[model samples]
Target: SPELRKDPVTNRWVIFSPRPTDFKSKSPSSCPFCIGREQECAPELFRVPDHDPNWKLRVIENLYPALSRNLETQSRTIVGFGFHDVVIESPVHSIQLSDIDPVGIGDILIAYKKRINQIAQHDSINYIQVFKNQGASAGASMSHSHSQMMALPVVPPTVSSRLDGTKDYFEETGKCCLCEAKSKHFVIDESSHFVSVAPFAATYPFEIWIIPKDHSSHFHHLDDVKAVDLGGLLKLMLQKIAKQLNDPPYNYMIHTSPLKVTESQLPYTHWFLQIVPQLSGVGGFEIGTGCYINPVFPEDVAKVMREVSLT
Candidate 1:
C-alpha cells in the first residue's frame, strides 16, 4: 500500500511506495531513446528527420503513459485519478541539452510548443505541465534524454494558487503581477552568457528566472526572430553552467498562463522559464517548514555567471 506523507511546513501530501522494491541494483545498458526503435514506442506524434542518417528529435506516446488518452470524456468521475504522458526530447541515445546543437534545441522547443497548444485545446484538460528531469537524483529512470508533458483533467493546486494570486494582484493594483515584477527588473548581470537576477520572493537558492522583456502568453506566439533569440539565450545559459558548475543535474520548466484565455483576465500574465540546479537535498527543517534554506545567494551566482563570457 502507498503511504501518504505530508510535509509539516507546506502541508503538501506526497505518496510513497506506490511500487516499492529494491531496484537500485538494476540498471539498463541500452538506451531506449535512440532511433531505429520505433517498435519500442507506442506511436510517433512527431519527429524531425535527420539530414545525415540520424534523427535529431522525436515525440511519441508512451506505451506506459501515465495519463491514458482513452479518457476523452469528463462525464465520468472516480474517487482517485490523474493523467500524464512521457515525452522523449531527443532521438540521440547519449546526448543532453548541453550537447545538442542550437538548431536542434530550437527544433525541440518548437515541438514542445506544438504539443502544448494541442493539449490545451482539449476541453478535458485544465492544466498542462511540461518539464524535464536530467539525472538519477532528478527522478529519471531511463538514462536517455527525455521530458514529460502532463495534461490534467483539473487544475493543479500549485497552478490554481498562482493563477488566483495573479488575479488578485491584478484586481487590487490594475496591473499584471508578473509584468509588474519583471518591469522593475533589468538584466543587471549576465551569467553563463545569459541574464540572471534574484526575483522577489525567490523560493530556492541561486534560483534564476529567465523571461522575455515583452509580455507574451504563448511561446509559439513569438515571431521567428524572437524564437531564435530565445533559443540562443537558453543555449548560452546551459553551456555556461556546463562549463562553470561541472554540469550538475538540473530540472527546469516553462510556466505559462492557461490556454483558455477566458479563464483569467490578466493581460500581462506572461510566461517564463524557471531553472533550478539541484546542488543540495532537502532536509527535515525545510520539510517541516514551508521555507527553504539557501546556502548560496542569487546575487553571487548572478555576479559569477555575468563574468563568464560565452564567446
Candidate 2:
C-alpha cells in the first residue's frame, strides 16, 4: 500500500511505499496502446468517437497509478487519493507526437479539454495536471506517444505559489504579468491565437512556453477555432525543437486555473503550456534547494529557434 506523506518542515508531499516502481519496457506490438490490445490494459474511460468502432485517441485509468481513487479525507496523513489516467495519443506505436498531423493533434487537444471538464465536476478534486513525457530520459517507461494526468485533491505547492504571486501582482499592476510579458523578450513564435516564447528565467537548457494572448482563465474556455490553430502551431514548434536538437527527450505541462474560479480571479489567471527538454541533469545544488542552474541562455535558444527553418 502507498501513503501520501508531507514533510514537517518543507511541507512537500511524497508517496512512501515498501516497493519502488519499476517500468518494464516492451516492443511496440506488445505495447498496450497499440490496436487489438484492448485487453492488455484497463478499460477505457471513453474514446474519441462514441460511434466509431475504432478510436483515434483513448483515455483509460492507469493500471499502475501513483494515486488511488478510493480515498477518505485526511486525518493524520493523506491517503494516495486522486485520479490518475493515461491518454493514448494514437494507435501507431512508432510515431512521435510531432509527427501527428494538425487534425489528429486537434483531436488530442480537444480530448484533453473534455477529460479536464469531466474531472472538474468532481468536488473532491482541486487541481488537474496534464503532462507528457516523450522518451526514456523524460521519465517515460513506454516509448509510445502518450500523456498522463493527475487530478489531485490538493492544489500543488508550485501552483499555489504561482496563484498567490499572480494575485499580488494583479492587485498592484491592475493587469496580469504575463499579459505584459507576451509581447517582449525572447519570443520565438506565434499565431493569431498563441504566442511561443523562451521564458526570461528558464531553469532548463531549452525551456519554452506556449501561451494564449487572450486572458482566458481556464483551458476549457478555449474555442474550437483556436484549438485548431493550436494544433498546427504546436506541431510546428515541436518540429523546430526536433530539427534544432535532433529530437531530444522532453516533457511539457499544461498549467491552468484551479478547478473552480470567480470573476475576481480571472484577471490574473492565465493558462499556458511549458515545454522543457531533458538536456540537463540534477546536482546537489538543485536537489537540496528548489532553485536550478541553467547552462544555456534563453535568448541564445530563442535565437537558434528563430534561425531554424522547418522547410
Candidate 3:
C-alpha cells in the first residue's frame, strides 16, 4: 500500500506509490474518453449534463490512484488513505477546455467545486486540491485535456508554512498580506468577483492570481456568479498567455485554505487561483537551492496584459 513518508528535517511529506500511473496513449480515433469507449476507464463518480449526457463534463476515479481510501492495517509511514479523481473537461476528444466559451468553462469549474466538496466530506481528508497538466512534458500523457484532483490526509507543508507566515503577519500588522498586495501591486485583469493580480516576487514569469475580492478561506464558497466570472477571466487570461508566450504549456491550481488551521489563522488565509506558465527550464543551481531564477519581470508581464492584450 502507498503511504506518506515525512522528511524529518522540513517535515514535508512524500508519497511513495508502488503502482504505475495511468494515462491515455491512444490516437483520437480510439481515445478512451470518446463517446463510445467510456468503459475503458473507471466508473463515473459524477457528471453534469450539457446538451446531452454524451456531451457532459464528468468525474471518474483514477484507474491507478496515487492515494486510495484503502490502507494497510499497519504501515511504515503515514497512511496514504485519500481520494483521487479526474475531471473530463469536455466530452469531445478534439476540444480542449481552453477551446470553449467561459460559460462552458464555468460548468467545468462548478464540476470541480462539486467534486471537491464530495471528497472533503471524508473524515480523513484535509486539503482538496484541483490541478491540471496541459502538455505531455508537463506530466499529461492524455491529449484529451482534463484536470485532476487529490484529497490528502495531511496539510501539505508548503500550505501550512505559508499560512503560518500569513497568520504572523496579521498578528503583527493587523492586515491581510494579500489584501494589501492587491492595492499595492500589479493588477492584470478583473471580473465582478475576481481580480487577477501579479505577485511581487513571482516564482515564474507571467504568474497570475485570480482571487475573490471578498476574502474567504474556503474555495468551496464560490457562488454561481463568482464561478462564471472566474471561468470568463480564466479564458481571457489563458488566451492572452497563449498569444503572448506562443502557447507554452502551463499548470494552474487553487491555492486555498485547508481544514486544520486555527480560526485565528483563517482570516489571513485568502483563497486564490494560481496559474504558472511553463516557459523556463531549471538547472543545478535551482534544483540544489530551490531558488527560482526568472528572467522576466512580473509587472512587465502584467503591463502587457493590462494595456496591450486580453481584451
Candidate 4:
C-alpha cells in the first residue's frame, strides 16, 4: 500500500509508493483511450451522454493510483487514502484538447465539476487536485489527451500556505488578492466570466492564469453557462501558448480552496487555473529552496501571448 508521511522540517506530506508505471510511448495505433479500445483501459466511473457507444469523453479510474481509496487515514503518518481518476478528454487518439470546440471543452469542464463534487462527499477526502500533464516532459504517462484528479485525505502544505497567505492579504487590504488579480499590463485575454493573465511575479516563463471574474472559491460551483464561457477562453489561451511557444509540453492545474476550509476563510480563498509550459528545466537551487529564477518578464510574456493571432 502507498503511505502518506509528513515531513517534520517542512510540514509537507509525501506519498511513498513502489507502484508500476502505466506509461506507454506516444503511439496512437495502440492507444487504449480510443473509442473502440475501451476494454483495454480502466473501468469507467462515468461517460458523456449516459453510456452512449460513441462517447466524446469518459472519466475512469486510475490504473496506477498514487493513493488508494480503500485505505484509512492520520497522526504524522496515514495510509495513502484518496481517489485518483483520469478524465479521458478525447475518444479519438489523433485529437488534442485544443483541437476540440468551445462547447466540447465546456462538457469536459462539467465532467470535472461532477467528479469533484462526487469526491467531496467522502469523509476522508479534504482536498482535490485537478491537473493535466500534456507531454513526456510535462509528466504525462499516456499520450491520449487526458487529465487527472487526486483527492487527498488531508490538506497539503501548499494549500494551507495559500490559505494563510491570502488570509493575511485579506486582513491587511480588505480585498481578496485574486479579486484584485487583474494587472493591466499583464492581461492576456478575457471572456464573459474569466480573465487570463500572466501573473505579476510569474515563477515560470510564459505561465498563464485563468481566474474567475466573480469570486468563486470552489470550482465545483461551475454551471453550464460559465463552463462554456471558460472553455472558449481556456482554448484561446492554450492556442496562443502553443503557437508562440513552439508547441511545448505543458501542464495546467486548477487550484481551488480545500473542501473542508473554515467559514471565515471563504472570502479570501478564491480558485484559479494555472498553465505552465515546460520551456525551462528545474535546477538544484529551485529544488533546494522554494524560490525560482524566471528568465522572461511577465509583461513581455503577456504582450507576446496577447498578440497571438488566433484568427
Each model's lDDT: 0.60, 0.75, 0.72, 0.79
Measured against the true structure, the TM-scores of the candidates, in listed sequence, are 0.78, 0.87, 0.86, 0.89
Tens digit per residue, CA lDDT, model 3, 24-113: 112154478776677898878877783355666778888889986676332137987877888888778877766788887888888877
**How much lDDT does candidate 4 score?**
0.79
**Per-candidate count of clashing residue pairs (backbone under 3 Å):** 4, 0, 0, 0
Candidate 3 lDDT score at position 173: 80
Candidate 2, after superposition: displacement of residue 293 in Å? 1.1
On residues 50-90, what C-alpha lDDT tens digit does candidate 2 reach at each position?
Answer: 53658888888899989887773641467788889999888
Clash pairs (backbone) in predicted model 2: none
Ranking by TM-score: 4, 2, 3, 1
Give the runs in model 3 whose Cα sits over 4 Å from its true position.
1-30, 50-52, 72-76
Q: After TM-score superposition, what is the CA distance of residue 176 in candidate 3 from its true location, in Å?
A: 1.6
lDDT of each residue in 38-149, candidate 1, tens digit only: 6777777767663334667777776677766775763256422234556666666777776776666667777777777777677767667777787778677778888777
Query: Alpha-carbon error at 301 in model 2, in Å?
Result: 1.3
Instruction: Give the per-residue Cα lDDT of candidate 2 at 174.
Output: 88
